[PDB]
Amino acid sequence: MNLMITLLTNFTLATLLVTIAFWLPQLNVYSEKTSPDPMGSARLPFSMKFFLVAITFLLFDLEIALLLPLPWASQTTNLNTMLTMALLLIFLLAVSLAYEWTQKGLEWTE
Amino acid sequence: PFFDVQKKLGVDLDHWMTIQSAEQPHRIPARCHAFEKEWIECAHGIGSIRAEKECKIEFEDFRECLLRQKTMKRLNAIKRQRDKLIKEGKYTPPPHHSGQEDLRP
Amino acid sequence: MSLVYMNIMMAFTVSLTGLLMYRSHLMSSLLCLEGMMLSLFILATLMILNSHFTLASMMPIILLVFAACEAALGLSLLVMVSNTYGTDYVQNLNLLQC
Amino acid sequence: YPTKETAHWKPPPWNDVDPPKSNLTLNFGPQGVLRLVMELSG
Amino acid sequence: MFMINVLTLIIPILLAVAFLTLVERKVLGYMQFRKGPNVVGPYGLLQPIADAIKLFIKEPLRPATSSISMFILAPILALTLALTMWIPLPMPYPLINMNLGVLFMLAMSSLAVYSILWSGWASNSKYALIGALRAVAQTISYEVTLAIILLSVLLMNGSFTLSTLIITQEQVWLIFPAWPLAMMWFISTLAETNRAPFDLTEGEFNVEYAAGPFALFFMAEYANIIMMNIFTTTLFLGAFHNPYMPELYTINFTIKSLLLSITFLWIRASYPRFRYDQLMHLLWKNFLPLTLALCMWHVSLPILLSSIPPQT
Amino acid sequence: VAAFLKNVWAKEPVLVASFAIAGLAVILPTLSPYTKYSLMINRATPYNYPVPLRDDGNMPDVPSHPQDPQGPSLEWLKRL
Amino acid sequence: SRGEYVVAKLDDLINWARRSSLWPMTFGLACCAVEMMHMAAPRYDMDRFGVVFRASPRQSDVMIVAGTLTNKMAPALRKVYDQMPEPRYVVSMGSCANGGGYYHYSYSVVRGCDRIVPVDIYVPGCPPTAEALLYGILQLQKKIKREKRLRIWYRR
Amino acid sequence: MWFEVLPGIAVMGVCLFIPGMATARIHRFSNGGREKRVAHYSYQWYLMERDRRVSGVNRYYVSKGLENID
Amino acid sequence: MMTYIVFILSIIFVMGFVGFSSKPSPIYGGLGLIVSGGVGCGIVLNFGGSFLGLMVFLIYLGGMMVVFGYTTAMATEQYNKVVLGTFITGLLMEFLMVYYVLKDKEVEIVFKFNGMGDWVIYDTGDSGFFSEEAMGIAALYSYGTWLVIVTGWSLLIGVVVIMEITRGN
Ligand SMILES: CCCCCCCCCCCCCCCCCC(=O)OC[C@H](COP(=O)([O-])OCC[N+](C)(C)C)OC(=O)CCCCCCCCCCCCCCCCC
Ligand SMILES: CCCCCCCCCCCCCCCCCC(=O)OC[C@H](COP(=O)(O)OCCN)OC(=O)CCCCCCCCCCCCCCCCC
Ligand SMILES: CCCCCCCCCCCCCCCCCC(=O)OC[C@H](COP(=O)(O)OCCN)OC(=O)CCCCCCCCCCCCCCCCC
Ligand SMILES: CCCCCCCCCCCCCCCCCC(=O)OC[C@H](COP(=O)(O)OCCN)OC(=O)CCCCCCCCCCCCCCCCC
Ligand SMILES: CCCCCCCCCCCCCCCCCC(=O)OC[C@H](COP(=O)(O)OCCN)OC(=O)CCCCCCCCCCCCCCCCC
């Protein structure tokens, strides 16, 4: 309840500041501006490499999502199994990184 | 095809997450542990065809523990009759159902 | 049953019919598909937290991860479509009628 | 059995490979001083 | 009374962000054998006030926006996420004491790239969109080592509770068992906030915003800078906490966080920029393999030493 | 095995430190004498209630009071 | 009156904030760019006056035309000038920006930048020194200090 | 010289000292001159709500000791 | 009103899906799914699933919808009746459901649903010094061995498959 009040207060302060930034200098009666970029009007060329680094982020972030219960998982009684599976998850993240390396996936954004 | 590799090789690949009555971490019971244990111990070994008619009481108990539909229907009836008697002025709530009695412990 | 399950199931069916009635884009289709996955996450989570079935609390995370990986696959499929026609329009995917 | 609807269908190519059916030009102008016309391939 | 506490959080954040700009211009001045601002105020203290009044009465730049709604929402989201990263911060008591404050901060910092992305698409410039995609890919790249380094350090904490992280460091600073994680953390948080030598937004996305909303993006970015320095201070340089005198902890973490923010200011006046592929090479081929190796080491290390921290 | 190791430490020291730290993380819990104490501390942390047993008549090793001598002891945890 | 006092104090406030936070966009055309780079150097240090070093042309407050304006770049100068938000000011630095200078009778030189943009401060020299350019910037600040935007708005 | 940057650092340091000092004094004022009760776990919440019921003033922080038993 | 808050969040949740199931544009669709993920996270938080809700933020929103908006911003070059009609259709269906289940305390679209607030179905005990949800997620490494093997293998194969099908060779 305190957190919802805090979030609402921060959103209200941000919206108030954004409204003051978008409406206080509108009251200036300066002048109408007649006829208000490196590429002129060409279409945006699709970069395969930006999409590749985004999907590599998504997959390694999923592996991070598997790694996130480890400070709680160190408290278990089956520690040999836990340690094996934790090292196996970080090892499979490293194998994902090594395969991303050696098949030229980390290139021109290395 | 149900190639029961787990029972053949003696490994436990996915039986632990199967039911709520299984071995939980730190011995946490589910909210319907007793009902599911009774339904499983009723319906064990006798087959599904016999189990649908010979364990109907345990399964209705366990389903009504899970979803609480009869419980919520009874609470709906009690609360709606209470609201009708409040609207008609035939009833008043007690002081201990208003917040003026300094709860027990 | 409980009243929040009504809204989570109806959200799943809304995103179903959005995923079952395309307009033009494949990206809007994948958005409806991941809305379906999100509603499944919420519904499985509310069941498992309701019944206090402890071991299934790792279940929706798995339901996230696989399906999020699934989304990655679909995005790459979309990109290959957008590396042929310039758009992700589903009406350009009709070369297999004959 | 070609009908009126399935009459504009030609058979698919023999190797089943279809024909696929430009690089970016930037103007880093004056905005010492220098104008540049870049032909970039990514 | 809680609303007074929220105000005494969020208004001094804005004031410290306002005077961080003066401290940046002064510290970059003296490191460049010149002075910073010393004319507008006594010792320059009225320079941010003059500059804020200047920006709020400057003409609106009036762009042709692609989407009006996301053009409005990107400063709103940037400021809201810049302010909500402070509420679990234990100093020595947070505003919102929660069990998962670390994961909350990692989540609300993961949400910060939508402001960059919406501001880039809401501008009609394709060049601004390319710059926004580069900045988003950079930030989501370094969030990977943020998450993994942060997990590896919290394997010594026992929980995601930020208040437990002070109890963790009552005998030693946590930089002594984890200085390689500390230095990769420090460079990764330097790369989170688009901060030099990782500022490719200044090297040749929100250039279509007027002076007001661009100032709001700027102050959200400096709130993130102060916040990540405070979070690094709590995370690796945990101060002494006497519960009967909390101001000892407050003075101590304030001095350490000021030194760490000055260290950001001191890095930006020392190095040239990376090329974009060079910091991609820095993440994926230098920081992430060592981060995974140290994650294995900090998984296996409390087990081999019998130093597993408590769950509670 | 000797020139190759110095070569990869000269060219790519980040990767050598990576595989060295990961190799120590793999092998060293199997060689550490303190790995057993992690197990013994985690199983000695009482999250639940020690639900007592009905004294049927023959349980010589189960105590009747917590301060009785018989039962599990944690003097190894205090001393170490 | 009372409202005249209010518009006087608000003019003093907004003129203080506008002269104490000048953000320049410097056209580095020619040799005068070197002397602007000395006006940013540690001896003279524009940054201690609130005058930042190299603001972007869409958030800058004053355009310093520092060098020779040719015919090939005069539409680019006018484009950058039109893209500045108001209040925008123009400092003309050096003889070629002022009146053509040593290239006044040339076929390819705009005879002063004031044929292209409205100029506020003409800073004379070849090049004017960094101290003389800083003199021109402080004279621009004094010109902003006596602006009467709200007093004339109140009297209209 | 280099001590000219110190007024701005002092202003910024006071502005960072305000939130923690303020939340510490507010947590002492709103909780009877003590720390705020950390209830991260449901046992801690159970004890805190038991305190709220055993105080009689609907407040968890008003403590009752041996004077409340006979 | 406050005892129905999860229900109210769930209504916003359904509204959020009509924010993108009508499919206005994939960027407005992305924004609608972000707001939907936030409110559904709040629903998860209000049964006590804090870690699962922060997975909805960190992995679903901050991880994956980032990539959706990223890939979408690399398409649909920057500048309906059916959209607004389908939107108000789904909205009126949902508010008719609200009105029915609030005037009857019972509804049946496909299943029977109660009309009281969903606070009633909760448990009246404590979990001690652990979250049962946190310990069930910590159980992934001790009890969940086969699940970790197949999930890590599927993610490794996912990396391999993404690199194969995007190479074009
Ligand atoms: C929290 C407080 C602050 C923390 C410290 C940080 C303050 C200092 C900041 C200085 C300014 C930095 C500006 C940005 C610089 C960015 C560039 C950069 O540094 O790139 C990193 C560089 C990048 O490499 P590079 O580019 O320099 O080298 C060339 C690399 N190749 C060949 C691939 C092209 O180095 C790293 O990535 C190192 C990261 C940290 C390493 C930690 C190792 C710890 C030791 C482990 C054990 C080793 C022994 C072996 C095993 C023994 C077992 C017993
Ligand atoms: C948590 C703490 C945060 C602190 C933040 C702020 C830090 C700096 C605080 C201010 C330090 C001193 C500032 C002095 C500014 C210069 C004032 C001055 O001399 O103005 C002179 C001017 C003209 O006066 P005139 O009468 O013409 O003089 C001729 C004399 N024969 O007359 C005028 O200009 C009119 C008078 C203007 C007065 C303005 C004063 C500054 C206001 C700044 C805002 C913050 C206030 C302090 C907040 C914290 C303390 C409560
Ligand atoms: C485009 C739209 C506008 C964009 C700008 C604004 C939105 C984006 C920025 C704001 C993001 C809000 C995030 C809200 C939830 C954050 C997660 C959270 O609440 O975690 C903290 C805490 C978990 O810690 P714990 O200690 O376990 O809980 C106390 C019990 N021991 O959990 C709690 O303490 C739980 C408290 C009760 C439940 C709170 C529910 C809050 C309301 C729902 C979500 C609000 C945001 C919806 C939109 C998000 C869009 C991204
Ligand atoms: C068994 C332990 C656990 C192992 C798995 C966990 C690893 C944790 C760290 C994660 C690593 C992920 C990334 C791995 C990628 C490996 C492939 C690679 O990088 O090959 C290329 C590299 C030469 O670099 P190049 O291609 O030229 O780069 C261009 C810039 N010059 O080639 C090289 O630099 C050669 C790399 C191979 C040889 C490294 C030898 C290190 C030995 C350290 C001491 C012994 C440690 C014990 C373990 C040994 C395992 C082999
Ligand atoms: C009803 C009547 C009143 C109407 C409303 C007005 C309320 C009060 C507003 C503030 C004061 C207005 C007067 C402004 C200054 C006027 C006098 C002046 O210009 O003094 C000049 C003096 C410095 O002299 P200078 O010309 O710079 O010399 C160069 C060095 N030899 O300058 C100085 O010494 C410094 C001047 C500082 C100006 C005041 C401080 C800044 C404004 C603070 C309040 C507004 C902003 C609040 C916070 C915003 C967000 C941070």
Ligand SMILES: CCCCCCCCCCC1=C(C)C(=O)C(OC)=C(OC)C1=O
């Ligand atoms: C009302 C609260 C403050 C609103 C924000 C305005 C003041 C802070 C930002 C201004 C600013 C300063 C001081 C500044 O120094 C600067 O240059 C580095 C900027 O541009 C990149 C700025 O935007």
Ligand code: SF4
């Ligand atoms: S006025 Fe003279 S010194 Fe100055 S830029 Fe022109 S040619 Fe060079």
